[PDB]
Amino acid sequence: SLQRLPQRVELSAIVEHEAVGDDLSIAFAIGERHELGPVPIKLRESPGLMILGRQGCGKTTALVAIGEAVMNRFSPQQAQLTLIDPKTAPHGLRDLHAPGYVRAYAYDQDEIDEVITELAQQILLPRLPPKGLSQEELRALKPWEGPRHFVLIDDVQDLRPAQSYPQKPPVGAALWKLMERARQVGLHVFSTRNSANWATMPMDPWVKSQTSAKVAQLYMDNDPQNRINRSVRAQTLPPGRGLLVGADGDVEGILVGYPS
Ligand SMILES: Nc1ncnc2c1ncn2[C@@H]1O[C@H](COP(=O)(O)OP(=O)(O)OP(=O)(O)O)[C@@H](O)[C@H]1O
Ligand SMILES: [Mg+2]
């Protein structure tokens, strides 16, 4: 089937429905090819999302909705939220309230760098299998324990880049290699990026890591002259709407549910 999407849908309708196999998925939107019901993000297949859109398209709201979807699908022992918000976006991650779920929220660039590096080096790197092990030894290793870590990164274009005099690494760069290997350490990065400059957007290292990780990418409002791939062009769209594009090339028009 292929139905047309409403102007708006409440995220609470989406959550109450998913609630009612061996699922490892969250849902924060409805889809044209899902009979206007929830579109599950299968986290074993696509452990995160890259979200690309022009101003006003609903990048920030989508992360709020994803946060709320996480909290309704998982207990705090199963999932923790790390909130990265360099623009202190109005009505954004700063207002997502959940004690027990939020292990860190930061907006200051050095603070963000600290939070991401601590998570990557103290928590996630240990979950990787040690180097210099036989494949036989690797197959019998104990799996890591603890919660899955959902890192919500708004406005990656506003993260401070690498510099010299004084030397500083790009803010949050510690996470990039673990994002490629995210399926092994239970890391789930949902990052948004302004995409008015379609031509630099592929050079953004956050986009590179997510593409290299082969996560799905959500193309919200964009210039229809721009091409997602040989077969799919970007679309101009109202807020909350986007083209969900899998690494396999599958494409769905979706509508992000409006958060509580
Ligand atoms: N899922 C949605 N459904 C309906 N309307 C939405 C949705 N998300 C956002 N909007 C509308 O779009 C407006 C801007 O949303 P938001 O601030 O999330 O966009 P943004 O892309 O993060 O903006 P910016 O590019 O300025 O950071 C909201 O105030 C709301 O009016
Ligand atoms: Mg925003």
Residue numbers in the entry: 1129 to 1148, 1152 to 1391
Which of the paper's sentences describe this entry?
EccC, the motor subunit of T7SS, is essential to assemble a stable membrane complex for the secretion process. It contains a two-pass transmembrane domain, an unknown function domain (DUF), and three Fts-SpoIIIE-like ATPase domains (ATPase1, ATPase2, and ATPase3). In this study, we have provided high-resolution crystal structures of ATPase3 domains of EccC proteins from Mtb, all in complex with ATP. In our structures, ATP and a magnesium ion bind to the nucleotide-binding site in a similar manner.
To explain structure-function differences amongst EccC-ATPase3 domains, the crystal structures of Mtb ATPase3 from ESX-2, -3, -5 were determined at 2.20 Å, 1.97 Å and 2.00 Å resolution, respectively. Though the sequence identities are only 20%~30% amongst the four ATPase3 domains, their atomic structures can be superimposed and have r.m.s.d. values in the range 0.99~2.02 Å by comparing Cɑ atom pairs. Here, our structural data showed that the recognition pocket in each EccC-ATPase3 is different. The signal binding pocket of MtEccC3-ATPase3 is much wider than MtEccCb1-ATPase3; the pocket of MtEccC5-ATPase3 is much flatter while MtEccC2-ATPase3 has a shallow recognition pocket. The different shapes and compositions of signal recognition pockets further imply that different T7SS subtypes could specifically recognize individual substrates.
